[PDB]
Amino acid sequence: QVQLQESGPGLVKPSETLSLTCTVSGGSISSGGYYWSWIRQHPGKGLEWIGYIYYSGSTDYNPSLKSRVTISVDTSKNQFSLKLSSVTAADTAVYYCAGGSTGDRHYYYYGMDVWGQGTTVTVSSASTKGPSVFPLAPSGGTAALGCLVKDYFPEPVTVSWNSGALTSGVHTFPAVLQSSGLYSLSSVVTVPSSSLTQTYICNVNHKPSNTKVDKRVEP
Amino acid sequence: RTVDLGQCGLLGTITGPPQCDQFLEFSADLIIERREGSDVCYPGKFVNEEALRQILRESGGIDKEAMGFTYSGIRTNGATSACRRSGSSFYAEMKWLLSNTDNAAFPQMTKSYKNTRKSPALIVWGIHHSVSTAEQTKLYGSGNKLVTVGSSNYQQSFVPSPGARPQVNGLSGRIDFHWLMLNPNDTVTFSFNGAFIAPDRASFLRGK
Amino acid sequence: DIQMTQSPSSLSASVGDRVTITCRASQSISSYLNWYQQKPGKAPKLLIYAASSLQSGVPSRFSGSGSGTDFTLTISSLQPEDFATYYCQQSYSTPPAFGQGTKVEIKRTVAAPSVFIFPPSDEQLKSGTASVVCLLNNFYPREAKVQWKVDNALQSGNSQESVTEQDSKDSTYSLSSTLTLSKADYEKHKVYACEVTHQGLSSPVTKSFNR
C-alpha cells in the first residue's frame, strides 16, 4: 500500500538548482523493502533514469548527470529528494519518483512497481503568470461547451467539469505555446442540447501561480 | 481472408445491383476488385466514387441495417429492366419512389433516420435525372423537383436535370448516388417531392 | 553499461489484433527485464517483471517472454484502452536502462468529425483580443485540414491548432483550431466561418456565426 507523491516548484531559473521531494506513505522509507529512484521524461522523449537511493543511504547516479545530481533520504520525514544543479532548458521535463520492491532472487527483481504522479519542471527565466478563463458556448441533438484557458506560465493547468462529476465526452486539449511566450488551451465537453437548464462548470487550477478559477457556460 | 468481387463493383455492395446480391454484407480483409466489376444496374455513378472506394478498401466489409422508412400516398416499388432478377427489379438497398399512378401528384415528404449505433452509419441516396421532362412528369408528377439532405454536418440541395444521355444498359436517364458518414446519435433528414432514390438500409463498416 | 534496443518505435493495429513489441539487450541480462505501460500524461505502470511475471491485476492478454538478450511483450487481443507507449527496462545491472519506447496506436474505420464554432466571450473582448475556436470532435483518421474565413476572406497565419491523444474508448481524435485577432480586426467584420476537410466528408463542412 506504498504510495508516492512529488512536490516542489514547477519553475527554475537557468543556472539555478532544481529541488524536488517525494513523500512516501504506507511504508517506512528505510525498512529495506524498497529502493527509491528518480526518473525524468523530456517532452516527446523516453524515460531517463537519474539515480537510485537505497535503505542504507548509498546512491547510484546516471554517469551523465553525476556532476550535478544529489539524491538524499530524510527518514524523519519519510521522504527522499532530488537536487540537480546548474540547470538548462534541457532539464525541462516531467520528473517522476518511483520505488522498487527489493528481492531475494535478485535485488531489483520486481522492477519499479510503485510510481509517483510526476511533476512538471520548466527551466526558464520568464515569470509565473496565472491564466484567464473565458467561456465557450454556441446542429441538432448534441451541443458543445468549453472553457478557454489563456495566457499562463508555466505548465501545467488542470481542468475538471463540475468538480469531476462530468467526465465522459470531455476533451482538454494539449496546451500550445503562443507567439507571446504564454500558454493557452481549451477544454470542451459535448452534452445533450436538451440540457441547455443544467449547469456546466469548468474547474481550472494553476498550481505554480496558486490560481484556481471556476466558470459557467451558456450562449 | 479475401473476397473476389467478380462482376460486383465495390460500390455496388452498398447499393446492391443484382450482380452484388451475394456481397450485400460481405466480410473480408482483402478485397479483390475485377476490371469487369460494375457498380450499377440502372445507368449512373457515385459522384464522389474513388473517395468512397478508398474508405471501403480500408474496411473489413459492411454490415447492413434497416433505416425504417415507411411511406404513404406513393409507390415504393419502382422497377427497371436494367436491374434484372428474372424480371424487372431495382437496387436491393434502395427504393425507387414513384407517384401512386403515372402522372399523379407526388406529395412533399420528409424522412429522418437517427444513427443509434456506436459507429458511424454510411448513408447513400440517389438522384434520378429522367430521360425527359415528359418522363419525369409521368414518374413523379409535373413541376420542379427538389431533394434536400440535412445532418449536423451537411445541408445540400439536389435538383434533377432531365434529358437524354446515350443509352447505357438500355436507358438514357441516369441515377447518381451520394454519400455521407452519419455520426453516432446524429440524424439525417431527407425532404423531397420526387426524383429521389431513397435508402432502405444503412451500412456500417466492419473493422479490417 | 548495458543498453536496450527497443522496436518498433510506433505501431498501429486493429482491435483484436495480436501485437508484439521486442527488446534486445547488449549482453545477457538473465531474466531481469521489465515492461511498463505509459498512457499519455500519466506515470508509467509496471505490467510485467522478471521477463514473464504479470503484475497483479494486469489483464491476461499481456504476456512476456525471453531470457538472456532477446525479449518480447505480446498483447494477444489489442483493446482500445491499450493505446499507450510501452517501455522495456533491464534491472539486471546498475545503471538500469530503458528501451526507447513503442507507441501503440489503434486502427479503426473512418469517422467524420462533428464540427462546432465558438465566438469570443464578451469578457475577452473587454480585454482587447479575440479568440475564435473551431472544434472537430471524434474523428478518424488524424489527418484533417481546417481553414478560417471572415466575410469570405480566407485567413492564414493568425491561427494555431491542437489535437488530443487518441481516445481510450472509441479510438477517435479531437482537434481545436484557434484564430487570434486583436479587438480591432474582430469588430471590423461580421461573419466568421471554419471550413473542415476530412476523409469522412464527401465535401467540406462549414460552421459559422454572425458577430
Ligand SMILES: *[C@@H]1O[C@H](CO)[C@@H](O)[C@H](O)[C@H]1NC(C)=O
Ligand atoms: C447516444 O444517446 C443514447 C441515448 O440517450 C445514449 O445511451 C448513448 O450513450 C449516446 N451515445 C453517444 C456517443 O453520445
